[PDB]
């Protein structure tokens, strides 16, 4: 069963190819996760130069299999149950009064490493909106990711609203619609409605001159007693 693959520390690789309003970029990440504690740590580098969008707008795209599912909820952990063959994770991220990201990712094991490979496409961004104008603060709020089963697709859906702080004290909403479907043909766990409680801390490596993001993430399943 997939959950057995997560009882210890697992190395993580993340690779993203993006195009936002014609601005092409790539991000590479490395770190590790320990789902026992709902915890993952990564450092991401923009390998093409300067990132053309704010780092916070990429956090959700850049491994929910590292969520801590409490023992009494283990039967609701789709994410691990699809491993090692993995899952496709797709989103539409709608930035209020601005453009949208469409993302397609494959999350799977490559040997003993958990890999998140992503294509991101962003369109219809305003040239001096909060995203292409870089008006988002380098910080991140705590959210609830609401998950529901999609039995027709043998997977799940999720819906949630990310709140991005703007440098003038306002908030940029980013509505997330998500679908995950298994890559393999083995059975998966189809959960009851629940949510993941998320927390994120963004920082910088004081010795790093490349455009980059250091991330500490907690994800904890909740909403079933
Ligand atoms: Mg503020």
Swiss-Prot record:
State any GO BP term from the record: generation of precursor metabolites and energy
Membrane spanning stretches: none
Q: So what does mutating residue 193 to S actually do?
A: In EBFP1.2; shifts the excitation and emission spectra to shorter wavelengths and increases quantum yields compared to BFP
Please explain the role this protein plays, according to its UniProt record.
Answer: Energy-transfer acceptor. Its role is to transduce the blue chemiluminescence of the protein aequorin into green fluorescent light by energy transfer. Fluoresces in vivo upon receiving energy from the Ca(2+)-activated photoprotein aequorin.
The listed outcome for residue 143 to D is: In Cerulean; leads to improved quantum yield, a higher extinction coefficient and is 2.5-fold brighter than ECFP
Q: What is the effect of changing residue 44 to L?
A: In mut3.3; shifts fluorescence lifetime from 3.03 to 1.88 ns. In R10-3; matures to the red-emitting state with excitation and emission maxima at 555 and 585 nm, respectively
Please give the annotated consequence of changing residue 162 to V.
Answer: In P9; increases fluorescence at 475 nm excitation. In R10-3; matures to the red-emitting state with excitation and emission maxima at 555 and 585 nm, respectively
Effect caused by changing residue 37 to N: In EBFP1.2; shifts the excitation and emission spectra to shorter wavelengths and increases quantum yields compared to BFP
Annotated effect of mutating residue 171 to A: In mut2.1; shifts fluorescence lifetime from 3.03 to 2.50 ns
What happens after mutating residue 100 to T?
In EBFP1.2; shifts the excitation and emission spectra to shorter wavelengths and increases quantum yields compared to BFP
Q: Which family does it belong to?
A: Belongs to the GFP family.
Which Pfam families does the annotation name? GFP (PF01353)
For this UniProt record, the keywords arranged alphabetically read as follows:
Chromophore, Luminescence, Photoprotein
Question: The organism sits in which domain of life?
Answer: Eukaryota
Q: InterPro entries from the xrefs? A: GFP, GFP-related, Green_fluorescent_prot
Name under which the protein is recorded? Green fluorescent protein
**Mutating residue 28 to R has which effect?**
In mut1.28; shifts fluorescence lifetime from 3.03 to 2.76 ns. In mut2.2; shifts fluorescence lifetime from 3.03 to 1.94 ns. In mut3.3; shifts fluorescence lifetime from 3.03 to 1.88 ns
Q: What is the effect of changing residue 193 to I?
A: In mut2.1; shifts fluorescence lifetime from 3.03 to 2.50 ns
Outcome of altering residue 188 to A?
In mut1.5; shifts fluorescence lifetime from 3.03 to 2.72 ns
Q: Tell me the tissue specificity.
A: Photocytes.
What's the impact of mutating residue 64 to M?
In Citrinine; leads to excitation and emission peaks of 516 and 529 nm, respectively
Give the consequence of mutating residue 140 to H: In mut1.3; shifts fluorescence lifetime from 3.03 to 2.78 ns. In mut1.5; shifts fluorescence lifetime from 3.03 to 2.72 ns. In mut1.27; shifts fluorescence lifetime from 3.03 to 2.85 ns
